[PDB]
Amino acid sequence: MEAAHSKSTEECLAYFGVSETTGLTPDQVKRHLEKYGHNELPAEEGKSLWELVIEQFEDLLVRILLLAACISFVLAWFEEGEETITAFVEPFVILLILIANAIVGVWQERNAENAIEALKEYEPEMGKVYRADRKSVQRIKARDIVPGDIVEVAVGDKVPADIRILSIKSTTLRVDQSILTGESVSVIKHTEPVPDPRAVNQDKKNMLFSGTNIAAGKALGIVATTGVSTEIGKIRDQMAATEQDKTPLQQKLDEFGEQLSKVISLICVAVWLINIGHFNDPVHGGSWIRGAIYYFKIAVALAVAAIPEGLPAVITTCLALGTRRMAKKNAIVRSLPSVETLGCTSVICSDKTGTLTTNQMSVCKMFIIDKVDGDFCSLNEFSITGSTYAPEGEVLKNDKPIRSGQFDGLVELATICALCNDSSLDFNETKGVYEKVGEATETALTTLVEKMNVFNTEVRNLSKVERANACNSVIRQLMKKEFTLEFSRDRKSMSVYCSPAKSSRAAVGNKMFVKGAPEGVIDRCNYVRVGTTRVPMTGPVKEKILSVIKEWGTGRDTLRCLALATRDTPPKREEMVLDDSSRFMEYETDLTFVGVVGMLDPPRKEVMGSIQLCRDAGIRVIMITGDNKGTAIAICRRIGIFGENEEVADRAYTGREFDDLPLAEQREACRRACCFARVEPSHKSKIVEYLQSYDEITAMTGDGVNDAPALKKAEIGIAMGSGTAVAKTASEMVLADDNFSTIVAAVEEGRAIYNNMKQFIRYLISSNVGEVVCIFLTAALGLPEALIPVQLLWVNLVTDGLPATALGFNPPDLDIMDRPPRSPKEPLISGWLFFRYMAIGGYVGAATVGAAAWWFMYAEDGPGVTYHQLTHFMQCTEDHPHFEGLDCEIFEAPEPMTMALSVLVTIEMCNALNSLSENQSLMRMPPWVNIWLLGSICLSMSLHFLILYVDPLPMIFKLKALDLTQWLMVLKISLPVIGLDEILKFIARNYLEG
Ligand SMILES: C/C=C(/C)C(=O)O[C@@H]1C[C@H]2[C@@H]([C@H]1C)[C@@H]1OC(=O)[C@@](C)(O)[C@@]1(O)[C@@H](OC(=O)CCC)C[C@]2(C)OC(C)=O
Ligand SMILES: [Mg+2]
Ligand code: NA
């Protein structure tokens, strides 16, 4: 393999020692295959169904539950017999939540798609080569093609390896490498070497890239690199060497797990110490075995009370909803977990042409020389109208209408436009619009022609399909297009050789019409054309031309300028080598300037507003274009990235200036830059790394397979809905309408989603805190189980999930896009907030335990234990004589439990209202603000009545409905919650740090 683009035609055949007429020999093929390997992109992640499920049981919180479901399965099995048929219900429900939960993880994943697998498609199944054992061409599998052997490709064929072209069999060879370079039109290939050893792929005119298509022609070539060493295999290597972090929330989740693990084990050490007097008890006492069942059975209650089981459900249904909500605004979010790391974006690098602008070119101004008398000079500037490609508009000189024929300068400018142009128009009936056929800036030229019919040829007497290429084909019949010197970035221009048509145009027949960048072609102009006559380019005339070119392309117009010229007396046809673009700049010299054409790519309207919102939201926007740095900047000023008068010396670099910088200033330029002139893929990936070294959340746009490694590296890669499918699969989101204003509409929902999603998380987390306080009082004291695991699940999954998912429908703040981007290191609960849940929890923990111990003691209808030990329920059946006058089975009564479960369920609807806002009082922000919330609270309550009054339900949850007075006890305990928090909110607002 090797950098063949520069060597030559023989230096390559020699390097490998292979004959262009024989190919590689069977022995060579064997050795080469051993040294370079097969022509493939490496294998895949052999992730097995067994490992995928094991991945499921590696979370700390999922393991903690699995252990509990076991301890609970052993209890609800052996020790505990008869008197209960529900044993196993507890272990069974926990297992469902797990195994069922793991299905989510395995389905979710099986439907996921690898960006690196998307490339595998750009590989032809087979290829055509010339081996040294058959004169006929053989057609083997692309997999066996090797560096060095002679390959043949023709139209349709998809290039099998990176090939260095030896000789073109056809008259012309056209390749389509848009996916790998971004070039829209099929490009022309050659055989002569490219001197530069560090050329970009756009300039390796003598190379075929594995993965592209042969648009036109047939040619032979020697295979340079194979498999992973090809321009596409090198991309596969960057996307694979790259590592995806994880949405900050997923990080805060690993953090919460580690903690909710340390705390749990502490709670047991604590509970154990609180009950240390037991080491001061009778050795023969008894109940020894019952005590262990109490602690083992409270361990399962502790675990299902600490972990928020409904959450994974509430979060993914909140995202899936928003997903659909964004999709109505052309933002197709692929990865859900990524909706969070969007609200946090601080920098947005967008591509210009398709996303920032319309990419719908049109000429607005023209100008030809009118007089050149010594140092005096007068131009002839025109204005044209029409923004579509539609041949409808007029040419107005000085605001005033004009007939283009009346100017001779304008007769030529119009041919150079219709002759030096590979693109045309087309009118369809389907949508009744004029559709650009070839290129955007070329089709804009044929359109210019139609609007200024210099010959005034009749046309209103024609249809619309035809009207399209009317004035153009009349000029096509006046000159005969011999050949054409294609565009190449070296000279930045193109031309066409044209001889006349008949004796009606015999005079000075052979002409050469060239159009290119102004600086370029104007240096090669020895004359100017004033009408039908001619003069020598002189200092004054040249400065008068270059200035107007500056105003047009740097002024508020931000027009892209084209200079058109002609080579009056071209070289003899025979004296031209029409197959080596290197010499092409020699044939386009000694020109006579004819005029320049200034066109415009109108920027999408809503873009100008989107840029403004980012200014307010505190997000930095970087424009990445191709325009020279002069107009690249101008475009920034027009849209808002830069101020009309704002300085831009250190905030706008070109790909070259940036490279010339030392790693230090390079990294410093990235924290202030807002526009990058001419950059390639190399650059898009470096800027991400620098933007990342400042711990920034960056968005990046792309469409080609060459944009894949950069989209994967940016926190959120935004692929174009019209770009390749490999880009889409390496991106978090896809802009259906390639509109930049769509990104900003998506950075807003992300902030909205996360704000709501932030509330319901704090909510659910706080109720878990309360259930833990309860279980911890119940055991520290010795009291009888107030709350059972089965009940807690119902609550965490259903009765709390409903008020939880409804909080996701909260009204978005009105200043969401006036605040800076959120920091990813912002914790969900800390400072004062940590203290309110610390207090609210401590409250419900008391309310639940208490409301149960109440029905025991000061209970209008139940046992009774004013101040004595109802806590020693463990030791009674045998201690009935000692303070125990009654039945030792009341301690398994349902009333106490449904007492404490009703105080939890209601203290939860209360807390769901305190959660409509972090610090806003309920008087200032009423519950009816969110209807879904109130409506879910009802469904929760009724859902609560269901498991009390039904039949199999009250039995399996161990709950017996409670009378109307016991319900009023629940309210008198619960409701005051809304007060304890209203008071805590008042604190935060008033007395405190704002
Ligand atoms: C949950 C039940 C119990 C019994 C418990 O023990 O919760 C503990 C206390 C604390 C711990 C959480 C481990 C948690 O760990 C962290 O990472 C912190 C620093 O962020 C954290 O401090 C907060 O929770 C969070 O942010 C969660 C963000 C998703 C507050 C919390 C929960 O206390 C309070 C009062 O909410
Ligand atoms: Mg691209
Ligand atoms: Na990415």
Side-chain angles (χ1 to χ4, degrees), residues 418-475:
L419 302 189
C420 187
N421 185 308
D422 307 329
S423 172
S424 67
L425 287 180
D426 176 67
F427 174 78
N428 77 133
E429 293 77 2
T430 297
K431 297 182 288 189
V433 175
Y434 285 116
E435 303 187 306
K436 158 183 81 67
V437 179
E439 198 171 330
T441 88
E442 281 197 311
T443 191
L445 286 184
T446 78
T447 287
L448 175 54
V449 162
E450 297 292 319
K451 299 206 263 221
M452 61 177 272
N453 64 350
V454 195
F455 297 133
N456 307 290
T457 63
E458 281 307 298
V459 81
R460 42 187 162 188
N461 319 306
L462 300 171
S463 63
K464 279 195 166 185
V465 293
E466 177 293 314
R467 175 59 173 107
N469 314 270
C471 300
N472 281 297
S473 49
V474 312
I475 294 187

Side-chain angles (χ1 to χ4, degrees), residues 252 255-256 259-260 263 306 761 765 768-769 772 827-829 834 837-838:
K252 282 172 260 179
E255 172 185 20
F256 171 81
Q259 291 304 293
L260 175 56
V263 153
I761 286 176
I765 287 294
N768 274 122
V769 166
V772 166
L828 275 184
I829 307 171
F834 177 105
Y837 292 132
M838 180 76 172

Side-chain angles (χ1 to χ4, degrees), residues 249 251-264 267 302 305-308 311 761-762 764-773 826-831 833-841:
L249 187 105
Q251 284 183 3
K252 282 172 260 179
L253 187 162
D254 299 322
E255 172 185 20
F256 171 81
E258 305 319 316
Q259 291 304 293
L260 175 56
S261 188
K262 298 173 188 176
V263 153
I264 278 172
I267 267 184
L302 180 52
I307 304 163
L311 204 50
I761 286 176
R762 303 171 143 172
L764 293 176
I765 287 294
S766 74
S767 100
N768 274 122
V769 166
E771 309 172 320
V772 166
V773 166
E826 183 194 342
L828 275 184
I829 307 171
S830 61
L833 190 52
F834 177 105
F835 182 79
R836 289 162 50 178
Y837 292 132
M838 180 76 172
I840 304 294

